[PDB]
Design a protein around this ligand. Structure first.
Ligand code: SAH
Length: 400
């Protein structure tokens, strides 16, 4: 035990009036609740911005994504206006590396504007500070939703993808974004020959462990019935799956935007080319903890189901398709990262700086590091061949 937090008391109250809550609802509350959220007001973590992401590991990573943006823009017929959208830019490191490294491509750089989709006002402020040129001392970061980069590239912040202008060809970047979206969890009961949903209820049992607990819905919930067509047909008892419905909805918005106005999305994340049975994890001060251990104090994440993203896009039966996933290591090698590593290394004379650069390269591409756990998938037009996906597989059962 420990004594009951105010956020736990509040979540218990929801279960008393509304019944046990879906894991989707729980993840939204735990992250984004105004008063007790993790993503909204955590404050003062260990080290400087929480965790090791790929942009912060190497400039190599952002330069390669930059090359992908330019090559894809070329493959689209070099449109005079191109939007670049990023989902959850973090501190803005990725965007900064892209905008730095793609300045040399004059024709490309003259066509771009940037749109960052960001819900957190804290991250918004950090991104603005990281990306913008400022002419005034007093900056209120909330009335500043449009800005200019020091190279004069326009950057606009919006809360949701829906708010991004339509009818312009668009690149979409989602880097470690889908792993932080809510999921639902379902499990099959042979005792009721059907799927149940896994819910979070209050835990007042005589020797429970925490103040919340996982329960199985009595029958199928309305969500179970609504998504039955996405679940396995194989009813094995206790078989459990995670479904990233929030992410599937975003995948459809991107696919449909691309069908209408052209474009391409690059989704990079840790995950699998199959249904993910169990992956929801809670990390607090760099230690794995239980999900229901003081909720709101720990960062929740999931491993991404790339397969269901792919099938969902394909099921739209429009001009869009999804190709991949391919491993991050293979993707980046195919983009020319080894050549760039050597070029950057030759300009450096330090050896200490070169050793650091090579380790960052190894962290990105080695199979024991991020090389295989991290994967890349593209949502794009059927008729424009994607860049960096030559090793993508063919999925016969899903192409008629
Ligand atoms: N529903 C939502 N709308 C907008 N942004 C979201 C979101 N859910 C999560 N995010 C954002 O996604 C980011 C996850 S952290 C990843 C940061 C960055 N891409 C990097 O790898 O360095 C956070 O900045 C968070 O604010």
């Amino acid at each position: 035990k420990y004594p009951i937090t105010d956020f736990e008391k509040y979540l218990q109250d929801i279960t008393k009036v509304r019944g046990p809550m879906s894991i989707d609802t729980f993840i939204k509350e735990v992250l984004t609740n105004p008063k007790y959220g993790y993503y909204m007001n955590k404050d003062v973590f260990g080290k400087g911005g929480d965790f090791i992401t790929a942009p912060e590991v190497s400039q190599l990573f952002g330069e390669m994504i930059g090359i992908w943006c330019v090559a894809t823009w070329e493959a689209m017929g070099k449109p005079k206006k191109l939007q670049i959208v990023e989902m959850g830019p973090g501190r803005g490191t990725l965007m900064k590396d892209i905008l730095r490294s793609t300045k040399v491509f004059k024709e490309f750089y003259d066509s771009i504007s940037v749109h960052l989709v960001e819900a957190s006002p804290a991250n918004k402020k950090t991104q603005k500070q990281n990306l913008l040129y400022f002419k005034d001392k007093a900056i209120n970061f909330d009335h500043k939703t449009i800005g200019e980069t020091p190279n004069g590239i326009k950057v606009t912040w919006v809360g949701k993808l829906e708010e991004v202008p339509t009818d312009i060809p668009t690149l979409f970047l989602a880097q470690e974004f889908f792993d932080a979206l809510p999921i639902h969890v379902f499990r099959f009961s042979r005792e009721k020959n059907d799927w149940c949903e896994v819910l979070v209820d209050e835990d007042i049992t005589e020797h429970g462990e925490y103040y919340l607990r996982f329960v199985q819905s009595k029958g199928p919930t309305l969500m179970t019935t609504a998504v039955k067509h996405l679940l396995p047909e194989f009813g094995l008892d206790g078989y459990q799956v995670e479904l990233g419905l929030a992410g599937l909805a975003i995948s459809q918005q991107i696919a449909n935007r691309i069908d209408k106005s052209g474009g391409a999305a690059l989704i990079i994340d840790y995950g699998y080319d199959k249904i993910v049975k169990s992956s929801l994890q809670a990390i607090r001060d760099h230690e794995f903890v239980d999900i229901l251990d003081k909720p709101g104090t720990a960062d929740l994440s999931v491993w991404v189901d790339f397969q269901t993203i792919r099938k969902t896009v394909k099921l739209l039966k429009n001009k869009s398709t999804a190709i991949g996933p391919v491993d991050q290591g293979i993707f980046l090698k195919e983009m020319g990262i080894e050549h760039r590593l050597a070029q950057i290394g030759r300009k450096l004379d330090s050896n200490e700086k070169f050793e650091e650069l090579v380790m960052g390269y190894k962290k990105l591409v080695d199979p024991k590091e991020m090389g295989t756990n991290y994967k890349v998938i593209t949502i794009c037009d059927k008729n424009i061949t994607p860049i960096g996906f030559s090793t993508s597989k063919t999925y016969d059962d899903e192409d008629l």
